Amino acid sequence: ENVAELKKSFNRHLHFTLVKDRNVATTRDYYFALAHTVRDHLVGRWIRTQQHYYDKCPKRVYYLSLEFYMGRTLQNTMINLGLQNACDEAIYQLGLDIEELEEIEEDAGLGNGGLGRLAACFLDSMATLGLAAYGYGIRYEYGIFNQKIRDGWQVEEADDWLRYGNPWEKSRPEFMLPVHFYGKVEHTNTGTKWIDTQVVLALPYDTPVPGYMNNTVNTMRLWSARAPNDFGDYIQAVLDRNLAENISRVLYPNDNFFEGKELRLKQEYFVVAATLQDIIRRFKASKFGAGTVFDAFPDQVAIQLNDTHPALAIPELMRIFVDIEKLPWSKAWELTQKTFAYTNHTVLPEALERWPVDLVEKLLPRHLEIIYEINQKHLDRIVALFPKDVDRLRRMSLIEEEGSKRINMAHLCIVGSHAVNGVAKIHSDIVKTKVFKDFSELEPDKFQNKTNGITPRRWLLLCNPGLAELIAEKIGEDYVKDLSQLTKLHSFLGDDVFLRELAKVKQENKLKFSQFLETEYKVKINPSSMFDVQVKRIHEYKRQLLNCLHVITMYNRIKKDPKKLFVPRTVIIGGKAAPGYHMAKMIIKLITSVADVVNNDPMVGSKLKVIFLENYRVSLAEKVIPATDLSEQISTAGTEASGTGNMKFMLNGALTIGTMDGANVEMAEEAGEENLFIFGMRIDDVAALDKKGYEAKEYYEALPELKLVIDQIDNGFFSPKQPDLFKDIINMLFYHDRFKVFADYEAYVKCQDKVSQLYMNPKAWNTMVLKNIAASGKFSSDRTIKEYAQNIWNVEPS
Amino acid sequence: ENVAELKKSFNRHLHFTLVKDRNVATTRDYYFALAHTVRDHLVGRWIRTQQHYYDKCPKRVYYLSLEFYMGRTLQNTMINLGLQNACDEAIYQLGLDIEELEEIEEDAGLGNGGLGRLAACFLDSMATLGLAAYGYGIRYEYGIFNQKIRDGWQVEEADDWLRYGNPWEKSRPEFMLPVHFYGKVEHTNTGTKWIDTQVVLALPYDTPVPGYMNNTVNTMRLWSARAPNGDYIQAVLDRNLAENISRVLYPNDNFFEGKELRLKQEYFVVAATLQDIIRRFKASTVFDAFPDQVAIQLNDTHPALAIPELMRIFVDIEKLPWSKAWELTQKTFAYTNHTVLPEALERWPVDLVEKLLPRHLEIIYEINQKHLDRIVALFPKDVDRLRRMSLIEEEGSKRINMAHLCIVGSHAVNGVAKIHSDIVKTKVFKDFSELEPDKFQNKTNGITPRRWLLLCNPGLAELIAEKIGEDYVKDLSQLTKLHSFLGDDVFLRELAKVKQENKLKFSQFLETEYKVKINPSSMFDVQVKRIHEYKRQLLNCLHVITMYNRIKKDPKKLFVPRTVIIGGKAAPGYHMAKMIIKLITSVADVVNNDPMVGSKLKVIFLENYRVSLAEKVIPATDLSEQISTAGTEASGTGNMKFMLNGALTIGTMDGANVEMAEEAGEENLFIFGMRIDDVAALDKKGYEAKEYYEALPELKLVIDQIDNGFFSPKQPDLFKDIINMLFYHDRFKVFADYEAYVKCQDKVSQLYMNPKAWNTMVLKNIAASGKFSSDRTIKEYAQNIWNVEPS
Numbered sequence A: 001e002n003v004a005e006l007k008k009s010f011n012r013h014l015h016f017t018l019v020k021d022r023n024v025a026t027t028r029d030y031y032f033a034l035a036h037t038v039r040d041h042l043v044g045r046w047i048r049t050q051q052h053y054y055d056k057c058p059k060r061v062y063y064l065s066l067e068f069y070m071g072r073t074l075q076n077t078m079i080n081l082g083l084q085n086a087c088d089e090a091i092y093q094l095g096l097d098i099e100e101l102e103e104i105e106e107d108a109g110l111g112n113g114g115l116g117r118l119a120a121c122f123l124d125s126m127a128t129l130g131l132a133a134y135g136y137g138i139r140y141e142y143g144i145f146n147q148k149i150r151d152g153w154q155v156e157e158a159d160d161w162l163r164y165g166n167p168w169e170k171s172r173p174e175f176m177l178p179v180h181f182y183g184k185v186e187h188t189n190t191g192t193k194w195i196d197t198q199v200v201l202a203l204p205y206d207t208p209v210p211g212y213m214n215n216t217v218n219t220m221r222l223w224s225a226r227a228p229n230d231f232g233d234y235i236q237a238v239l240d241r242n243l244a245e246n247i248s249r250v251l252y253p254n255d256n257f258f259e260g261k262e263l264r265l266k267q268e269y270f271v272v273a274a275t276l277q278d279i280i281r282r283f284k285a286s287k288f289g290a291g292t293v294f295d296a297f298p299d300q301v302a303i304q305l306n307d308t309h310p311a312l313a314i315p316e317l318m319r320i321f322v323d324i325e326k327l328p329w330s331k332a333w334e335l336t337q338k339t340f341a342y343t344n345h346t347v348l349p350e351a352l353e354r355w356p357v358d359l360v361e362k363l364l365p366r367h368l369e370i371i372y373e374i375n376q377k378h379l380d381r382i383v384a385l386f387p388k389d390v391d392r393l394r395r396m397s398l399i400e401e402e403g404s405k406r407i408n409m410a411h412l413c414i415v416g417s418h419a420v421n422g423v424a425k426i427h428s429d430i431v432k433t434k435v436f437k438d439f440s441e442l443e444p445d446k447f448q449n450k451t452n453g454i455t456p457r458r459w460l461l462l463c464n465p466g467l468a469e470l471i472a473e474k475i476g477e478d479y480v481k482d483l484s485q486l487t488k489l490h491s492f493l494g495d496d497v498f499l500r501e502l503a504k505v506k507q508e509n510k511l512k513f514s515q516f517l518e519t520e521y522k523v524k525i526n527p528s529s530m531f532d533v534q535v536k537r538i539h540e541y542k543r544q545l546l547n548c549l550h551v552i553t554m555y556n557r558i559k560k561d562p563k564k565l566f567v568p569r570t571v572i573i574g575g576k577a578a579p580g581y582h583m584a585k586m587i588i589k590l591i592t593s594v595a596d597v598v599n600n601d602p603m604v605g606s607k608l609k610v611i612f613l614e615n616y617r618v619s620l621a622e623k624v625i626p627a628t629d630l631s632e633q634i635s636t637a638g639t640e641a642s643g644t645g646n647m648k649f650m651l652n653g654a655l656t657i658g659t660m661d662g663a664n665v666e667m668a669e670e671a672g673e674e675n676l677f678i679f680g681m682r683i684d685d686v687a688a689l690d691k692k693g694y695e696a697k698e699y700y701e702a703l704p705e706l707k708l709v710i711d712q713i714d715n716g717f718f719s720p721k722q723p724d725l726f727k728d729i730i731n732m733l734f735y736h737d738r739f740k741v742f743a744d745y746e747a748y749v750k751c752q753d754k755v756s757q758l759y760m761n762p763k764a765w766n767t768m769v770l771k772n773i774a775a776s777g778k779f780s781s782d783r784t785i786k787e788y789a790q791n792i793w794n795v796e797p798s
Numbered sequence B: 001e002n003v004a005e006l007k008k009s010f011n012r013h014l015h016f017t018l019v020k021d022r023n024v025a026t027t028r029d030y031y032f033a034l035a036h037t038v039r040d041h042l043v044g045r046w047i048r049t050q051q052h053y054y055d056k057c058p059k060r061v062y063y064l065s066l067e068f069y070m071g072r073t074l075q076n077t078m079i080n081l082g083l084q085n086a087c088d089e090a091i092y093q094l095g096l097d098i099e100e101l102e103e104i105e106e107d108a109g110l111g112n113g114g115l116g117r118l119a120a121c122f123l124d125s126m127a128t129l130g131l132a133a134y135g136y137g138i139r140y141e142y143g144i145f146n147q148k149i150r151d152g153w154q155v156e157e158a159d160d161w162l163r164y165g166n167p168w169e170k171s172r173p174e175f176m177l178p179v180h181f182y183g184k185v186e187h188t189n190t191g192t193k194w195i196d197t198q199v200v201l202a203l204p205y206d207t208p209v210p211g212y213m214n215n216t217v218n219t220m221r222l223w224s225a226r227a228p229n230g231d232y233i234q235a236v237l238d239r240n241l242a243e244n245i246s247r248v249l250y251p252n253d254n255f256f257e258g259k260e261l262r263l264k265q266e267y268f269v270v271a272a273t274l275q276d277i278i279r280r281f282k283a284s285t286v287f288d289a290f291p292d293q294v295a296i297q298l299n300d301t302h303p304a305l306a307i308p309e310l311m312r313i314f315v316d317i318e319k320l321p322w323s324k325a326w327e328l329t330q331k332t333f334a335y336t337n338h339t340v341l342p343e344a345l346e347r348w349p350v351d352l353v354e355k356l357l358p359r360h361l362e363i364i365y366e367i368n369q370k371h372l373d374r375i376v377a378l379f380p381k382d383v384d385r386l387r388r389m390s391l392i393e394e395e396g397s398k399r400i401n402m403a404h405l406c407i408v409g410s411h412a413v414n415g416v417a418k419i420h421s422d423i424v425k426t427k428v429f430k431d432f433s434e435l436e437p438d439k440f441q442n443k444t445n446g447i448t449p450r451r452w453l454l455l456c457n458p459g460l461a462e463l464i465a466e467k468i469g470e471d472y473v474k475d476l477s478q479l480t481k482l483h484s485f486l487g488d489d490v491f492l493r494e495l496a497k498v499k500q501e502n503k504l505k506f507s508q509f510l511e512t513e514y515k516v517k518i519n520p521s522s523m524f525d526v527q528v529k530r531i532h533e534y535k536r537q538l539l540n541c542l543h544v545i546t547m548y549n550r551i552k553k554d555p556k557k558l559f560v561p562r563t564v565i566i567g568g569k570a571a572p573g574y575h576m577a578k579m580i581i582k583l584i585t586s587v588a589d590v591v592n593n594d595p596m597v598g599s600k601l602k603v604i605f606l607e608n609y610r611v612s613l614a615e616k617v618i619p620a621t622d623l624s625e626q627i628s629t630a631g632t633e634a635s636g637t638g639n640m641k642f643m644l645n646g647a648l649t650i651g652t653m654d655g656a657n658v659e660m661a662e663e664a665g666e667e668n669l670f671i672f673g674m675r676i677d678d679v680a681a682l683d684k685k686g687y688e689a690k691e692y693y694e695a696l697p698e699l700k701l702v703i704d705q706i707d708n709g710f711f712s713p714k715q716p717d718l719f720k721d722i723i724n725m726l727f728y729h730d731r732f733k734v735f736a737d738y739e740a741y742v743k744c745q746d747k748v749s750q751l752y753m754n755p756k757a758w759n760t761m762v763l764k765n766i767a768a769s770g771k772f773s774s775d776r777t778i779k780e781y782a783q784n785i786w787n788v789e790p791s
């Protein structure tokens, strides 16, 4: 019924909004016109949803994050509004390729990976469960960089996703706010005043987050920096306005790594000031002793801290409460802890934020004083409980007195939050009992666990219509808003017809994605090959290297015995490297050197193909994932706090090869360990090896197939023009590898062999896939948000 | 009919486009919703007009300019579409204040004054006459600065007119183009190649220019710079450099500032534009017809690089022989001169151009050498002629006389007023006019009667139409019909009433902004335009003080009250202009707070003078100050604005003032002071300012008062700089016109006491305004330079 109206609406927009006609209209014009057509169906419910929150005043959730890895919005919006099939019909009748139009949209890559993607999935889940949630972030003019491979190496290009404009955002001018920087503190008899500061304006841009088929559309408020107006040399002054606006210019491209750069600190405070102000504003403009207001603040507001990035929010709330609202420290401190909650995402020391006191002193002087306060009161408590353990004092202080006095933002988060959480059982256990044992001892109840999740809308209905259709056609639609209902799929473990249909879906995905790989890359894809893929950011801990040592091992075997039955494979590895990460870039170069050697060897032919999937990102993850057979999740045990990509492959029909790390463990729990290809060392095994001391050359000497791979890389087999090109990798691998690459090699290759074995038996392979898919339920972000809402936010879904 | 549809359309937009409802909607939302509602009526005719140009292929006009002083678009659009009364009715019924909404719109102040305003008026006129014209400029993220007065001095604030977005513009992404900078030249056997350059992208933003009631809507294409797609962070941040090319408009009026970034802008707009033009031409042996399909008007010497740029494309990229290219180039370009002041003439240092545009310096040398070779073959002995005509000023720092580049690469050169074009032709460029007499022309400036009458003065326009018809809008010449009422006393009361309603409506503006209390029966004496020593706001300032002194001296003599209003911005780097602004505000403070003067004399420095504000004050003035030194104002357009709006003019025989005297009758304008020759005869004898200081009593007091501290007790010698310039370095003869000026001003006050005769002179002036319509100006451009037919 809306087909004819959608068509008229589309024409209305191409004309009035794009000022074009079917003859001089670009593909982009059609994209824009469709986006506007679809976007219009959001306004009604968006105005309504927000109006409902004002009248019913339910407790609000504020997901404060420096990242929001959103991807494209069009298709995602069409599906959550039950409009995709109608729009597809509309665009078809107009003679246009709906798929061709969706590809015009630029990804909103305002994230690095995992962390920023958890925020996006959470927004979609909170809207679906009907919660009064808001996401607050920074509207980076440039998100994570577009990645190119030139001469084998990664090259970074600016991701100006806003060049042609973003129809999915609406500037909210009336809500602009000032943010302060530098200045000095002046204590007076009127309270404390922070003066002589530089002001920067925050202009919020709202984006709607449609819940899946439930009339609600929430808000994602992203802030952008702007120079204020008040107050030769004139030109430069106008140009210098770029400095203030530089605060929200680029997203820092570091995954699990702390770079103590001033501009980054400015961003963290930036989003924190604007957000808290806006939140205090909404609270006061709502229906909810001289000071009879803020007492109810904790029962109306819940601010979730995504990692330690917005940690400044705690002392910032104390600054407003004490300096501006004039509350006693006691009361403010009380309300602060009842308001904030912290989520930890890593145990890697290089990923922990420790800002130098010097930097914070000249940038946020009033906040350094507040952190000292919090700390002193914090240590006074510790002393009154353990007056002799002096070592306990420095281990719990928010200030690392060592060499360069820094602020342990993590510790700041634990005291200013009533709840701290990990993102996976094993991870939260380590966060609770190991990393912050001194804190958990004192506040056992504080530390919790909330296993991560992914939204089945974007990661099933959207990216895999075929698989979704298959499922709904056997157990209903219910599984969408209750992924747990996927267990019903166990009734078909014997049905051979269902297994052929399962395989067919995966097949259509592989063929549709192979064409993507042939119009982009040189190589020719073996459609019957097994799709072995590893896609995620490039880290030594995620160990794309281990996988790389495997491809070379497979290569060597084929050349050695060029007639032995080899189960063909299309090994796909992808992910971006942080510009300043040298080993990660060397690793990317390695991978592309091998590929070039494997794909052009006539003796190997269709047996083994290697592809470095370029510019891995959200919209691209939606193409490759539904098309994979084997998922690589091989990080060293204890390095991955959880992982979500592992969850994405599981719901989409891929088997998993990986260690007992992060969420992999819980995946084994749900599907049955035997139903996953688990291998290598586990927690304790890594511990026992660090005690004894790691000596890599012994595995090099005790493992034949390994020695050749390593010799080949080091002698120049994969880089004749530069014989010692990978010397750095070899040196790290032999005397500085803290991720035990060689230590898992044998268990890995042995595991991989089992994988190929099973692949030759489609009946059994697909049987394991069903068991995996049927056990994916737990890993839905809806389940995750329910636990957050019930055990941390104290809010009710819907 | 459309009131009900406009209302539904308005709601449609507030909801779908602003995501608001009548309860949480801001005034700004209502403005945006209305703009969108009105903007929608433009799409059909805009698509159509452009489509028509493609099919009928009429010769196109390209107004290439660094400035476009556009003002607000809403109301202007409503009027040219015959939609204002219907929209006003729509907004009224919805319970909103239409006027309140229009005030939300930010002016598109991408201009300095006069020059940039002539471009805007021209766009409106070309669209009205139905010509296939396009305006090409730079979309400055920041136009001319908003001006504030703090502690009496001018303070500059950034004019971020794009903060909340501009609904009147549409990015045309598919037409982005690359612009080159720096690099080096490498001559090879394949032609000439300009390599190793830095690239900057030009992203065009189109804005529709609705013709007045004629179905056509033209295009104004404005370009913005973009970078092409923690050493990484800094590199991403450094993208600001490339984008800095279109960041700000240089705020200099009649002044050359040889800054590199400015040169980058000039080339920037020139490269993108020419490329887009070559593109459109090819998308319609080829280039032979180029001059008959394209006409590129150079607004001043700012886009002069366009000439060698066209030669670069033709020769380096299109591979045409130098001869043919050079031929087509001259047939394509036309240059308009706007000033004779040496400090306003562009002379770029060769060194700068060599490292920025090396290929273009070679092209300019080429043009020059061939140019001098011709001069020699005609006058093989006059060596002095050679350096006087060369495009390179060999002197000290070798510079490029862009003006001379414009004369040889253009088939037509024009001034903007008879007297001015005569000086440009016979004096400034006599050596060029001698060789190519036919080349130099005159095109007296004009102003659009849509924006400067129907828009800013609905009352006066209504009055006129109600007596002679609507015709005067598309043929201002028809205003002469107003002569039939010179005797009608009822028409004179009605004329005065209109002016009165304007003054009262504007006085309220002056009271909600400034401290002072306005005398509604006073005479509104105003001077509004950029601050220059040549425009002489100073002379006016010496007059206010003279009036002040007289009142205190004889606090009972019959003094014709006046509200002297002076306004305009000063270029940040112009010291004398800023001193002058300070002076004016010091006097005002001394005149407005003197109880002995009271309602007799008020002085106001009108802050942040700009287009939308000119639309308020002009319709409200009685006396217009146009007192520049004879020969300094090439033309002026503000003088034309006041004339059409009911103000009398006091001024010298300069620029367009002369032609105004011609049309209305000299006796009908308060002309005074020296004329061309008189200024010449005084420069021959040599100017000695102290003699007028000694020979003129009332003058000595004013000057003594300023220099001793009467207008600055806390800083007794604050204006020493003004005094020194006024006494030993004044090249604009301020003191030399003082006596003739004050004497003239007295006559003005005399006539003001006789409303019957004052209003009789106003009618004669308004009735003679016809010539000064930009429609008339464009017709002459179209017929004698562009060879295009108005519709």
Ligand SMILES: O=C(Nc1ccc([C@@H](O)CO)cc1)c1cc2cc(Cl)ccc2[nH]1
Pocket (backbone or CB within 6 Å): A039, A040, A042, A043, A046, A167, A168, A169, A170, A171, A206, A207, A208, B016, B017, B018, B019, B032, B164, B165, B166, B167
């Ligand atoms: O940007 C929007 N409107 C707009 C309005 C006016 C203008 C300009 O006229 C400048 O304000 C530009 C964009 C917009 C509407 C909207 C609706 C939904 Cl559901 C989601 C995102 C949205 N963005």
Ligand SMILES: O=C(Nc1ccc([C@@H](O)CO)cc1)c1cc2cc(Cl)ccc2[nH]1
Pocket (backbone or CB within 6 Å): A016, A017, A018, A019, A032, A164, A165, A166, A167, B039, B040, B042, B043, B046, B167, B168, B169, B170, B171, B207, B208
């Ligand atoms: O900005 C416009 N459209 C637009 C198109 C797309 C988007 C977004 O989809 C981002 O590209 C925003 C605004 C626009 C339409 C229009 C019509 C006339 Cl008549 C005059 C000026 C105009 N500007």
Ligand SMILES: *Cc1c(COP(=O)(O)O)cnc(C)c1O
Pocket (backbone or CB within 6 Å): A112, A113, A114, A115, A117, A535, A536, A537, A616, A617, A618, A621, A642, A643, A644, A645, A646, A648
């Ligand atoms: C899901 C996803 C991630 C996170 O997955 P990991 O394997 O844990 O790193 C990162 N980036 C993108 C683009 C994703 O879609």
Ligand SMILES: *Cc1c(COP(=O)(O)O)cnc(C)c1O
Pocket (backbone or CB within 6 Å): B112, B113, B114, B117, B528, B529, B530, B609, B610, B611, B612, B614, B635, B636, B637, B638, B639, B641
């Ligand atoms: C008309 C106008 C001018 C022109 O002033 P002149 O003194 O004639 O050069 C300048 N600025 C604005 C805003 C105008 O409307």
Ligand SMILES: OC[C@H]1O[C@H](O)[C@H](O)[C@@H](O)[C@@H]1O
Pocket (backbone or CB within 6 Å): A113, A114, A115, A118, A256, A344, A345, A346, A423, A452, A640, A641, A642, A643, A644, A662
């Ligand atoms: O918490 C979400 C994700 O954040 C980061 O990506 C962590 O490295 C990953 O282990 C975790 O799953």
Ligand SMILES: OC[C@H]1O[C@H](O)[C@H](O)[C@@H](O)[C@@H]1O
Pocket (backbone or CB within 6 Å): B113, B114, B115, B118, B254, B338, B339, B416, B445, B633, B634, B635, B636, B637, B655
């Ligand atoms: O040509 C438009 C205007 O250009 C310059 O501003 C001149 O100073 C002025 O006299 C002229 O009216």
